[PDB]
Amino acid sequence: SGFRKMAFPSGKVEGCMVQVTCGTTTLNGLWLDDVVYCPRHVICTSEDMLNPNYEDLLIRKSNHNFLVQAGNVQLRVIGHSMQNCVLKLKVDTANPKTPKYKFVRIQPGQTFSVLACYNGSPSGVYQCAMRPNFTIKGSFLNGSCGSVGFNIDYDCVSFCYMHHMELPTGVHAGTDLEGNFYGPFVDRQTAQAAGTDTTITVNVLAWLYAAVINGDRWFLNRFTTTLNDFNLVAMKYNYEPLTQDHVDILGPLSAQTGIAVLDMCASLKELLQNGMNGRTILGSALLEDEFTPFDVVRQCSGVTFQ
Amino acid sequence: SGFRKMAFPSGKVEGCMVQVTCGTTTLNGLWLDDVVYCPRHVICTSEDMLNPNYEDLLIRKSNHNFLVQAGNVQLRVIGHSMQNCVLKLKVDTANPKTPKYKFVRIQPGQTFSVLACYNGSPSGVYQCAMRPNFTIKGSFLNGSCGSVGFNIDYDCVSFCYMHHMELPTGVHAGTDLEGNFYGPFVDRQTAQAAGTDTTITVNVLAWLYAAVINGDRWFLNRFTTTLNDFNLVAMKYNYEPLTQDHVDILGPLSAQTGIAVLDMCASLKELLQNGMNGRTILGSALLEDEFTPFDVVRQCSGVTFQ
Ligand SMILES: *[C@](O)(C(=O)N1CCC1)[C@H](CN1CCCC1=O)NC(=O)[C@@H]1[C@@H]2[C@H](CN1C(=O)[C@@H](NC(=O)C(F)(F)F)C(C)(C)C)C2(C)C
Numbered sequence: 274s275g276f277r278k279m280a281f282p283s284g285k286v287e288g289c290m291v292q293v294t295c296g297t298t299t300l301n302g303l304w305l306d307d308v309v310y311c312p313r314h315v316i317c318t319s320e321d322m323l324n325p326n327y328e329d330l331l332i333r334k335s336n337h338n339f340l341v342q343a344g345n346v347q348l349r350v351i352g353h354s355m356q357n358c359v360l361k362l363k364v365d366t367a368n369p370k371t372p373k374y375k376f377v378r379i380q381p382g383q384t385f386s387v388l389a390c391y392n393g394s395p396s397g398v399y400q401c402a403m404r405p406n407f408t409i410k411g412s413f414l415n416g417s418c419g420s421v422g423f424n425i426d427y428d429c430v431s432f433c434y435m436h437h438m439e440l441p442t443g444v445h446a447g448t449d450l451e452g453n454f455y456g457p458f459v460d461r462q463t464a465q466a467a468g469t470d471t472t473i474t475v476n477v478l479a480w481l482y483a484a485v486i487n488g489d490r491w492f493l494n495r496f497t498t499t500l501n502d503f504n505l506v507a508m509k510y511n512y513e514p515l516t517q518d519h520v521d522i523l524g525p526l527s528a529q530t531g532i533a534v535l536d537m538c539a540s541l542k543e544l545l546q547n548g549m550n551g552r553t554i555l556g557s558a559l560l561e562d563e564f565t566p567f568d569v570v571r572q573c574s575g576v577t578f579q
Numbered sequence: 580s581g582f583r584k585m586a587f588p589s590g591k592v593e594g595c596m597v598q599v600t601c602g603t604t605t606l607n608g609l610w611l612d613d614v615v616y617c618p619r620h621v622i623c624t625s626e627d628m629l630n631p632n633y634e635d636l637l638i639r640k641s642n643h644n645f646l647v648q649a650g651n652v653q654l655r656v657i658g659h660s661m662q663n664c665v666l667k668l669k670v671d672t673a674n675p676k677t678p679k680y681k682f683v684r685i686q687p688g689q690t691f692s693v694l695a696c697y698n699g700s701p702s703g704v705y706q707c708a709m710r711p712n713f714t715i716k717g718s719f720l721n722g723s724c725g726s727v728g729f730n731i732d733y734d735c736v737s738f739c740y741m742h743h744m745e746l747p748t749g750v751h752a753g754t755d756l757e758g759n760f761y762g763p764f765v766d767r768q769t770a771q772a773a774g775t776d777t778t779i780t781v782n783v784l785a786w787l788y789a790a791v792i793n794g795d796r797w798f799l800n801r802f803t804t805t806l807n808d809f810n811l812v813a814m815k816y817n818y819e820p821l822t823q824d825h826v827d828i829l830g831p832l833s834a835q836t837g838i839a840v841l842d843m844c845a846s847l848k849e850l851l852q853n854g855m856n857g858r859t860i861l862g863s864a865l866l867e868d869e870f871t872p873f874d875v876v877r878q879c880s881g882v883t884f885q
């Protein structure tokens with residue numbers, strides 16, 4: 274019993290982190306096989322980052338201008354190309370600790386663990402959600418760029434995020450591992466702001482299922498609703514529309530608790546209209562939307578990783 | 580910027596987890612050098628756990644009755660002794676991945692990461708606090724016993740907890756790595772309940788400092804108080820007494836923000852007496868007490884681990 278924000282074990286990803294320096298800019302890289310991936314603004318100075326021409330900055334660099342270190346050991350660079358907003362450095366050494374891995378572009382609503390790194394060294398690990406507005410609510414200081422987000426499936430690391438920047442309001446924006454930003458952001462120091470966020474409805478329901486499973490049941494009402502009516506009521510509270518796909522994905526939790534999704538939807542409708550009136554759910558005074566149905570099942574049924 | 584519940588990177592500890600089976604009971608062990616540590620109720624059946632005599636159960640076991648596996652590989656046991664509530668299995672192999680480590684008994688108020696494990700495999704990682712009443716608010720299913728809690732300092736893992744049991748209300752209780760329980764708990768299936776908890780005052784203040792650092796300042800008032808007056812007011816809200824040691828430990832955050840501890844204490848006194856009136860701090864509607872001063876600094880200044 275118990276329900277916690279839980280990150281994936283970070284060890285497979287720890288073994289991949291390196292420090293990348295170019296000129297006087299240092300940030301983190303990901304060393305998979307004989308390639309190091311990092312944000313392309315490693316090639317900038319402070320000044321440059323106000324409005325950089327990356328293609329131009331990169332033409333003036335040679336392999337030797339990039340210093341890659343894995344602990345004590347310097348890796349010798351033997352190639353470089355830019356792909357979108359990421360830089361690929363080919364190195365003379367394959368990483369012996371390369372885990373089985375993939376590069377995924379996740380969807381808004383999906384969660385992942387971030388391994389926050391400074392100078393190629395791990396600081397800590399925490400769980401995030403890709404927000405509807407394509408930001409994450411992270412914890413990132415100067416030096417954290419090139420920190421990565423990932424999911425583990427059995428033995429395979431799916432890398433889905435690399436950290437680039439912070440926006441007003443202290444939210445965070447980044448790219449997939451092919452260097453495409455999530456959302457409409459660009460890697461320059463100019464005024465940019467995140468769209469208005471919305472609440473990830475399917476995740477809130479997953480969390481309510483987790484609460485029932487943990488014996489917190491006070492909010493269960495005796496009603497049903499339809500998907501139509503629920504969505505009209507949720508729309509005014511800035512909840513995303515719940516689709517039939519969402520309903521189907523919540524099927525396992527539904528079957529496991531013997532509570533139909535639309536009866537839980539009835540319960541959430543009531544909580545949105547009446548508030549929690551001094552009560553908590555799973556220790557929280559606010560509804561939580563950063564647990565996916567998968568995260569709930571994984572946690573409440575004990576799924577592990579080799 | 581940003582502030583998150585952040586676990587230590589789990590990789591050094593991942594490399595130490597094994598599965599231990601005895602009879603038909605399987606749980607997790609910690610493999611350091613040529614010793615495996617696990618909860619001693621691995622030697623019980625279901626029936627036994629209602630009221631076990633461990634010394635008697637262990638006399639009837641030989642080395643070969645314990646099956647220890649590290650992935651595919653079985654480790655051959657060549658010795659066993661019991662120390663308090665933990666079992667030490669000497670094995671024919673030293674763990675090549677043994678990190679630098681220590682065994683620590685932490686104090687109430689201190690935090691640590693838990694690496695939740697099933698069948699010797701890591702499920703996930705999260706940050707906990709040892710409560711005043713000597714429980715933790717974990718997430719532990721059947722199979723999780725022998726999961727460990729730890730702190731990392733630079734390159735050294737301080738192991739401080741091994742998971743044994745769950746108490747009514749879904750809190751968790753366990754031992755240091757010498758097999759002494761935290762709190763008055765015993766490793767038998769009998770009615771036991773946790774003392775009434777209290778709020779870890781020094782941690783709440785640390786968290787308020789973290790909030791100022793992140794620019795959430797609305798609750799800062801213009802008053803001071805004395806340590807005496809603050810403690811009388813905090814006592815009625817089931818806050819622990821703040822000592823002078825607590826004040827001194829909060830010195831770095833105090834100096835870094837230019838807010839004296841007793842002025843923050845003035846601010847917290849007000850929050851306790853007036854509530855948060857619809858407002859959040861660092862995204863939370865409730866005051867948080869599971870961040871130590873160290874955790875705040877570590878997070879808000881970027882401390883890393885080799
Ligand atoms: C990252 O570049 C890094 O860690 N580096 C080591 C030296 C470079 C850094 C990480 N940071 C800094 C504090 C919060 C965070 O995530 N990222 C950057 O500095 C971004 C780089 C520049 C400007 N960056 C920003 O995040 C800025 N944001 C904006 O301009 C915004 F309004 F678009 F969001 C900043 C927070 C500095 C105002 C580039 C290439 C985008």
Ligand SMILES: *[C@](O)(C(=O)N1CCC1)[C@H](CN1CCCC1=O)NC(=O)[C@@H]1[C@@H]2[C@H](CN1C(=O)[C@@H](NC(=O)C(F)(F)F)C(C)(C)C)C2(C)C
Nearest residue numbers: 620719720721722723724743744745746766767768769771
């Ligand atoms: C742990 O033994 C385990 O995972 N095992 C694999 C087979 C043994 C198990 C972990 N659990 C189970 C669910 C929550 C949790 O932390 N721990 C135990 O079952 C405990 C073992 C028995 C009884 N245990 C309990 O946690 C029980 N608690 C109590 O009796 C209490 F009231 F004291 F807390 C239980 C939750 C099963 C009622 C021993 C040796 C204490």
Ligand SMILES: [Cl-]
Nearest residue numbers: 558559864865
């Ligand atoms: Cl909350």
